[PDB]
Amino acid sequence: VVTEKQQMLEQHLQDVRKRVQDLEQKMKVVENLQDDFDFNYKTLKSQGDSVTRQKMQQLEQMLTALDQMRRSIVSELAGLLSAMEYVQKTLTDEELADWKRRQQIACIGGPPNICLDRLENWITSLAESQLQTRQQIKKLEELQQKVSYKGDPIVQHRPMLEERIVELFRNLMKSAFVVERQPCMPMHPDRPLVIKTGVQFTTKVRLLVKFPELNYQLKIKVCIDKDSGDVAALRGSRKFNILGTNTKVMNMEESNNGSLSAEFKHLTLREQRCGNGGRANCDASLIVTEELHLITFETEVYHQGLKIDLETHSLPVVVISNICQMPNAWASILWYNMLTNNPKNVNFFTKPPIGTWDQVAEVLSWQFSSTTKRGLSIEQLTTLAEKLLGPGVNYSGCQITWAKFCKENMAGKGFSFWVWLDNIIDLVKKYILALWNEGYIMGFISKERERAILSTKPPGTFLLRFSESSKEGGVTFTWVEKDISGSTQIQSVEPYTKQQLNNMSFAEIIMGYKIMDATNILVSPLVYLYPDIPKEEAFGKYCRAAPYLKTKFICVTPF
Amino acid sequence: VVTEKQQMLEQHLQDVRKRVQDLEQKMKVVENLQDDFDFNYKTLKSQGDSVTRQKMQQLEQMLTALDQMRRSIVSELAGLLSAMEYVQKTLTDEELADWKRRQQIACIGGPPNICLDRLENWITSLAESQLQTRQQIKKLEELQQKVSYKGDPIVQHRPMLEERIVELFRNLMKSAFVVERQPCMPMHPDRPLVIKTGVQFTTKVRLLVKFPELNYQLKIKVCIDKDSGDVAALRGSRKFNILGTNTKVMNMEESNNGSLSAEFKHLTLREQRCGNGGRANCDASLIVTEELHLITFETEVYHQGLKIDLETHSLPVVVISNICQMPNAWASILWYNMLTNNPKNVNFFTKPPIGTWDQVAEVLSWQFSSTTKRGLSIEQLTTLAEKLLGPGVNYSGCQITWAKFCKENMAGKGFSFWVWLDNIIDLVKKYILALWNEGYIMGFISKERERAILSTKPPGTFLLRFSESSKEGGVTFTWVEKDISGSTQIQSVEPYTKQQLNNMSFAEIIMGYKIMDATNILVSPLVYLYPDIPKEEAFGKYCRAAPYLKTKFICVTPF
DNA sequence: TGCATTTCCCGTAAATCT
DNA sequence: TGCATTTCCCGTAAATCT
């Protein structure tokens, strides 16, 4: 939806469109008058070799009118240029930069709308206006060549008008070249900006100046680790080469809007080994999953007498060799994008920024709404801020460092916050998908606050939550059944590993768990999912000559 | 252990060794006499320019003696050559060829002893004898150059003696070049002669002529699909290239005997795609797993004035792209090696030979004793010949075709004999390993003959056997418990898939299977493994603040 | 050494051949 | 089309780096 700032932008772009038409009009008038003047002059000389009365006066008067039309045109052109310069900045430095920011956010699972359509229409309109304006300026030049005098408006301003129009266009083209789809392995659509060597990844660029004349004209060359990974910048770092079809012609193929774009598929990265390097300094100068790289795109455009070098790059990418490095790699991409809008700070992790629990929590919810249908409730969310910040009320300004979020292991645990959490999402995906869908799982809640169930709610009322001690990820629940109940003895079984969920699903465990009590009688999977809902309405939906005797496995607690 | 034929061989090789020493002796005598004759002659001429009485007689007599010694040497050399020619054939065409045959057999799991030691000692001894013999022959030549006459034994025979010795040596060197370790992926040690593109494989060659002078002198080049896959032979076939270190210098490294050998590791195959081919005719001219290739080794030896081109090749190899093709690929390697001793018939599967149940059964047992501690009992073996040949008594001359063994699916099944069986072995490996070890599993027995248990043995007596209907492979057992037993109602549960064995082991199923009968009471895992052994002595060996409630899964038949 | 990181390769699933 | 065959790539385990 349009904001007011975009409203004005569209408005101004139209005013510019209008002015250019008016000037085009004014150019036609001055040309015709110049032709009329030229013929009249010719006719007058071709006889002054008897001079018709008043015709000399007409010639002189035509000339004066020409002069004035020229002065006029030249100052309206200058004013237009200044307005193009002002608005172009709004277009490129404000609206386009905003898009790039929201693209970062969309990569890490945030509210999208990274649609380039409006921007492309804006950019193309401005570009057309600039090129037509340059054509009028070129025309003024050829008008001066046919007719000129001492104090000619064209001779004393035109060069500056040309310089300004060319600089504007040149810069507009360069801003227009962007990475529409950031590097991502199609196999891990929710993990853009993380590439594993040997696995195909794809990326796409777009030129927001929609000029049909340029269809199939430009050749885009992509590479990784250019320039800054040749002379000055980072050190100790690994270096890679892109393998696969290195170049790609830009065209209007997909036809959606017929926008100029170039898509690269089947790309692969391979470490460039041997030679001379270092690995000097601390952390071997950043661990593998914290090292950042840039994929660059370059091309040259020769358009209407101008040569313009276009270049753009991806957001920093983390390169891994094995998939087991992805959780950590992702955390890096989260932190980077959550905390900065600089598109090329590869040394970011030398001294990472600190985030607030606010921004960290949002980002965390996104991670869930991406892979699943819904994110995190503040019950599960707030009990998470506790697992990091300890006791308290409200967590807005509470600072979360990179070390706390992922770099170092949690309190007494032998794993990091992010990794434990990523492993959970992977569990909620490979199994328990819809079983997590609606509001089913409490998921995250302290053994403590896991008291406000059977101990306030009738015996039977159970819970659905994750194993806090498990690195790989595991699941569990609630129920009061063992010995002579004192004042409601709350319980949980030992969490089920990813393999343990191959043996029987969770809502199947929940609606197929009797509990063989000391009495030798298998008692019961407690009723009422926490609030007051009998297990059935929620969990019942996911449950299910001489022949071999069909069987089905169950564990159901042994005592 | 030495056979009588090998005894004679060793004997003859020694006789040859002896003769060469005797001739070496005879050469020394003739040389000295020639020197004596030469000096005497010199001395006699240097004065006949008065001649000492009787000295002319001595000179003449020395000459006659020389002549006779020469005739003698020349005929003993000829006889020796004929004996070297006879024995060499026994060495190379009989004993070495036998080794190659038993190497084939060892590849497909048969009784090994493919030790090259004896052969290498035999070959090296003969080679040394031949080279020394050639040196005596060369010497005869330089003796003739210093002293000769009309009718000289050396001039009229020596060229033929040279030709024969060189031909013998040349052929001995060529026979001596062999593939000691056939192409095999170290990852699948029991599957030699089957290579999957992209996976490393290793192979090794040996030169049985143990000459230290040649250490590090020869460079061996390996390749696949040479010559015959350039011009005349097979058609429609795929073609490959060996990637990795293509050449390898031959040396005496491992030092075990210090035998000359060249080992190639880290080799990889890749399909050579594009160009011009065909895939014309039926079966696209043999399916992938029936297509055969040869890996060739070549080198040149320049030794004591001779240039000898050595070449050897592997046994035909089947090339696959995915591991799922290995069962079929192996069957091909089994059939080939079980039925022929031709080392290079790549068109074998155009018209495969027929085997007898005898040879087919042996080979089948081998497949078990390879991967496990023991093969197949005739109970399990004979009940197998029934699954292929139907009813009968004795199966010796019963022909088994390639189609019956593997090419076409079994009777009413949607899979082939070999594949079902290979899948079983893979099951007996990944799980139930020792649980198969001793004599535990009956494994293969008709539902029919699976009557001679509870129905002749007390109720309780169970069985251990494989799923006949399962492609992927599965397992099952015996027990009489359901309703009011009539006259012993024999039973089996639905077989456990490879994944079903991750849920609980077989001897754990067997000693943890109660059977919840209609009476709501889980009854019992029947006692006495078939003969009369209470399940325990055999199967019992493989069985095994606020804490989470430790659990353990069981299926135990639901009725 | 123990650790960080990369390589190997099965087995499954998707892709391409034919 | 449906099939034979090859390619893709995770995830585990072994290997190499440092």
Short mmCIF file of C-alpha atoms in Angstrom, two decimals, chain A residues 447 465-469 476 479 482 491-496 499-500 502-504 509 513 546-559, chain B residues 447 465-469 476 479 482 491-496 499-500 502-504 509 513 546-559:
data_model
loop_
_atom_site.label_atom_id
_atom_site.label_comp_id
_atom_site.label_asym_id
_atom_site.label_seq_id
_atom_site.Cartn_x
_atom_site.Cartn_y
_atom_site.Cartn_z
CA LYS A 447 9.48 -27.09 35.10
CA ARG A 465 6.83 -29.20 25.53
CA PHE A 466 10.48 -29.69 24.45
CA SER A 467 13.47 -31.29 26.15
CA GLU A 468 15.63 -28.51 27.73
CA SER A 469 18.58 -30.87 28.29
CA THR A 476 7.72 -34.65 26.33
CA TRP A 479 0.40 -36.44 33.97
CA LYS A 482 2.43 -43.12 40.34
CA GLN A 491 5.34 -35.87 35.85
CA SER A 492 7.10 -36.09 32.43
CA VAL A 493 8.62 -39.06 30.61
CA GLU A 494 12.17 -39.18 29.16
CA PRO A 495 12.16 -37.16 25.86
CA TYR A 496 11.93 -38.84 22.49
CA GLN A 499 14.67 -41.66 16.01
CA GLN A 500 12.29 -42.27 18.88
CA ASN A 502 10.02 -42.95 13.99
CA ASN A 503 8.75 -45.62 16.39
CA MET A 504 5.40 -43.82 17.03
CA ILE A 509 2.07 -41.56 22.09
CA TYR A 513 -0.08 -44.35 26.37
CA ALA A 546 -2.62 -68.62 6.78
CA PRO A 547 -1.81 -64.82 7.02
CA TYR A 548 1.04 -63.31 9.12
CA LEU A 549 -0.13 -61.90 12.46
CA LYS A 550 -0.30 -58.08 12.08
CA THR A 551 1.33 -56.16 14.93
CA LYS A 552 1.84 -52.58 16.21
CA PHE A 553 4.49 -51.35 18.78
CA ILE A 554 3.99 -49.44 22.09
CA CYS A 555 6.32 -48.46 24.98
CA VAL A 556 3.89 -47.27 27.74
CA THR A 557 5.89 -46.74 31.03
CA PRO A 558 7.06 -50.06 32.81
CA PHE A 559 6.45 -50.34 36.63
CA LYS B 447 6.03 -73.42 5.14
CA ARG B 465 13.68 -68.02 9.05
CA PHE B 466 13.39 -65.33 6.33
CA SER B 467 10.42 -63.71 4.61
CA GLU B 468 9.88 -65.43 1.21
CA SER B 469 7.50 -62.70 -0.01
CA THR B 476 10.14 -64.31 11.24
CA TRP B 479 4.81 -70.83 17.90
CA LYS B 482 -4.27 -68.78 19.51
CA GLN B 491 2.23 -69.85 13.36
CA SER B 492 4.52 -66.98 12.21
CA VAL B 493 4.19 -63.21 12.67
CA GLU B 494 4.42 -60.61 9.86
CA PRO B 495 8.15 -60.19 8.94
CA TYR B 496 10.21 -57.31 10.25
CA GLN B 499 13.53 -50.51 9.87
CA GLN B 500 11.47 -52.81 12.03
CA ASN B 502 15.82 -50.77 14.57
CA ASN B 503 12.85 -50.88 16.96
CA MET B 504 14.06 -54.09 18.73
CA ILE B 509 11.81 -60.01 19.98
CA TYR B 513 7.45 -61.50 23.06
CA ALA B 546 12.69 -35.45 39.60
CA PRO B 547 14.13 -37.78 36.82
CA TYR B 548 12.37 -38.58 33.50
CA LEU B 549 10.56 -41.94 33.51
CA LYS B 550 12.78 -44.41 31.59
CA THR B 551 10.91 -46.49 29.00
CA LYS B 552 11.44 -49.39 26.55
CA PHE B 553 9.19 -50.35 23.52
CA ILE B 554 7.49 -53.71 22.71
CA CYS B 555 4.94 -54.83 20.06
CA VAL B 556 3.85 -58.33 21.28
CA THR B 557 0.84 -59.53 19.13
CA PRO B 558 -2.57 -57.68 19.87
CA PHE B 559 -5.73 -59.87 20.33
#
